[PDB]
Design a protein around this ligand. Structure first.
Ligand SMILES: O=C(O)CCCCN(CCc1ccccc1OCc1ccc(CCc2ccccc2)cc1)Cc1ccc(C(=O)O)cc1
Length: 194
């Protein structure tokens, strides 16, 4: 886990709960000696999962909850910072966001060096209302992060209600985690009333 999102995780606890609560969890995650949280440090993914596991005790909010509220915070925080860059990159909307993921992979890497491995595909399961996001990554439980970001930019920006559910989990049986995105444009396009 690169220090950017790792520091954003720290940020989540400090802001929404409190700095006092943060240091309590920091004790439990056995990360009392590690408070750098810088982008080039690259914290072990294990330390991130164990961190949220500790937060699941103190906050009582389970990993899935923390990861989703992380995505929510991440979006609103960036826009709150007043960075107009979020309005330019990723088209500032769900559709562009999804397909521009690999775009920031290269574009933002030129500014912040560091190996970023993107392996993902988006093919609908013969329905349209079911984009199968083929997510190839070892952090299978980091799925809720995607959920918390994508749904937020969808209905809040584009006004389109979409839901992403994990239909396949990376394990020994399957090297890939698959998501299904059910987009409801019938909420907007099917308003033939006046
Ligand atoms: O496998 C995985 O995790 C994902 C594999 C696909 C690439 N993955 C997309 C995540 C993503 C998925 C869906 C939607 C939006 C997403 O982007 C959210 C996002 C993530 C990170 C930053 C800070 C960037 C930064 C990094 C350093 C300095 C400055 C800026 C910004 C925004 C990016 C990524 C790559 C490697 C690592 C790692 O290795 O930890 C972690 C994440």
């Amino acid at each position: 886990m690169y220090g950017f999102v790792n520091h954003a995780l720290e940020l989540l606890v400090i802001r929404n709960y409190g700095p006092e609560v943060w240091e309590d969890i920091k004790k439990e995650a056995q990360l009392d000696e590690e408070g750098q949280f810088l982008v080039r440090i690259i914290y072990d993914d294990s330390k991130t999962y164990d961190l949220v596991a500790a937060a699941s005790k103190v906050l009582n909010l389970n990993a899935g909850e923390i990861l989703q509220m992380f995505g929510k915070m991440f979006f609103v925080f960036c826009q709150e910072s007043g960075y107009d860059t979020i309005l330019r990159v990723l088209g500032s909307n769900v559709r562009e966001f999804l397909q521009n993921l690999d775009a920031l992979h290269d574009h933002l890497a030129t500014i912040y060096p560091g190996m970023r491995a993107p392996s993902f595909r988006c093919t609908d399961a013969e329905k349209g209302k079911g984009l199968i996001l083929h997510y190839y990554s070892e952090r299978e439980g980091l799925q809720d992060i995607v959920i918390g970001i994508i749904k937020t930019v969808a209905q809040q920006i584009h006004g389109t209600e979409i839901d992403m559910k994990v239909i396949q989990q990376r394990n020994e049986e399957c090297d890939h985690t698959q998501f299904l995105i059910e987009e409801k444009e019938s909420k907007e396009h099917h308003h033939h009333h006046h």
